[PDB]
Amino acid sequence: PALKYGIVLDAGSSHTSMFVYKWPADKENDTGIVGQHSSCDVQGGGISSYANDPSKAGQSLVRCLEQALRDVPRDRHASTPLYLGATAGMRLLNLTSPEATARVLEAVTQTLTQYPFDFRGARILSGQDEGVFGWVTANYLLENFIKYGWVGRWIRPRKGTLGAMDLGGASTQITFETTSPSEDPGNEVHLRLYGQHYRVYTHSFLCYGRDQILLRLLASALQIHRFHPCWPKGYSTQVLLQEVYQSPCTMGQSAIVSLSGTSNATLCRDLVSRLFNISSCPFSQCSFNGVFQPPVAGNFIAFSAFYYTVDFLTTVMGLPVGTLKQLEEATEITCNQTWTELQARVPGQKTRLADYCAVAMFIHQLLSRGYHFDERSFREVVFQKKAADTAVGWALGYMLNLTNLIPADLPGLRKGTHF
Numbered sequence: 001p002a003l004k005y006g007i008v009l010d011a012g013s014s015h016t017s018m019f020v021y022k023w024p025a026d027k028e029n030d031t032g033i034v035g036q037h038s039s040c041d042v043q044g045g046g047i048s049s050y051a052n053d054p055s056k057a058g059q060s061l062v063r064c065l066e067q068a069l070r071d072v073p074r075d076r077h078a079s080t081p082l083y084l085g086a087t088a089g090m091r092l093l094n095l096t097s098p099e100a101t102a103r104v105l106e107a108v109t110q111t112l113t114q115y116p117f118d119f120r121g122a123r124i125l126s127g128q129d130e131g132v133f134g135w136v137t138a139n140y141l142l143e144n145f146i147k148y149g150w151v152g153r154w155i156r157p158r159k160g161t162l163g164a165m166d167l168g169g170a171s172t173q174i175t176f177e178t179t180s181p182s183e184d185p186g187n188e189v190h191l192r193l194y195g196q197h198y199r200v201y202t203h204s205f206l207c208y209g210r211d212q213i214l215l216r217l218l219a220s221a222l223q224i225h226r227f228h229p230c231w232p233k234g235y236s237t238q239v240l241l242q243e244v245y246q247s248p249c250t251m252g253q254s255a256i257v258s259l260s261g262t263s264n265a266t267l268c269r270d271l272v273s274r275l276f277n278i279s280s281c282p283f284s285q286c287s288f289n290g291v292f293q294p295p296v297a298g299n300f301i302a303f304s305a306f307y308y309t310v311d312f313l314t315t316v317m318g319l320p321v322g323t324l325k326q327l328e329e330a331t332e333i334t335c336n337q338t339w340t341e342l343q344a345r346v347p348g349q350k351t352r353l354a355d356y357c358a359v360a361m362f363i364h365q366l367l368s369r370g371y372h373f374d375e376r377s378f379r380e381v382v383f384q385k386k387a388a389d390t391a392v393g394w395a396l397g398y399m400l401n402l403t404n405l406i407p408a409d410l411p412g413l414r415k416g417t418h419f
């Protein structure tokens, strides 16, 4: 059972992760056959964090690349494809400076070309790419693309697919199979996978990733309140205004200001609600900010910072989140904690602790006000970060596409038996 390997570097907004995948050579076009072999988390910031020192972007990757040499058998290095895909961190940098962006891409390319893997390029994914490849990963891993049944008795309707919601640091994506008519070509996706047609909706909200939303709320709190209602009472920090307003996400919104929390769940809710413009919709139905969206439908997996935040609510706060009402209640309780009370629940390192209130509030509003989940549809949402021992994200679907491992049709069209 000879194995083949593939490597993807997920160059995310706040961090880079390396995934190494493996699959049997002779079974490689089977759905669900590829799985994660290993992974490595790059120390420090995302590659976009090196905009003013691009050489360091390439160097950042070396420790994980050295791991990949150990993870993949030597005799297989040369025929193992290596991809780097960058997402909203690089999309934002590209708005600020196409030149700095190109220099960062040049620096990672120079590093990656020094290694013995079959390097296939460093690219910035589109928002659509990011949404769709995440949806592909989840559904591939869970074997939803199998045609269930047997001759003369196929399951009808076709096996449902799992919608995907991904909360990264700089954008958030929602992607799902839909029967609704397409109203905006930018949201419309058609896939031909194992002989089947999937009509998919996708959208990426740039500036609605976790870190960018936290920056926007901080900017807003500074303007409206001169205290931060989402931060816990007794928490304060020295805010460098240059960092607050340097992002494309906050430009629209005295080197240093002190800012303190107040644990005001209601004012926090009000602050978060200003992130969603529902005033206008040029389509039959919108999510928010005038973006076309059909009604959510089917199961969904919510991963990345959706998962991390919900995991904090359930495991650290010890609160149920099974319903939208429970998620709302858990957010209110979290937001109403003082800084001492919150710290008492977290014996170890406290990074991100002051931010859970704001992120939880955001997620609740995004799902309920933004995407228009209600109790019935929300019941179909699961929070998970892994399937079949493989991290859920866009990297796997990306590798599958570029290595051409998912066929449009089954071999010989399976004699036409699925017609």
Ligand SMILES: Nc1ncnc2c1ncn2[C@@H]1O[C@H](COP(=O)(O)O)[C@@H](O)[C@H]1O
Binding pocket: 012, 013, 014, 015, 046, 167, 168, 169, 170, 209, 210, 211, 304, 305, 308, 309, 352
């Ligand atoms: N354990 C965690 N709890 C809450 N947020 C997290 C955790 N680990 C990572 N994150 C955040 O998830 C986001 C990942 O963004 P990205 O780098 O674009 O994938 C960043 O905002 C991270 O800070």
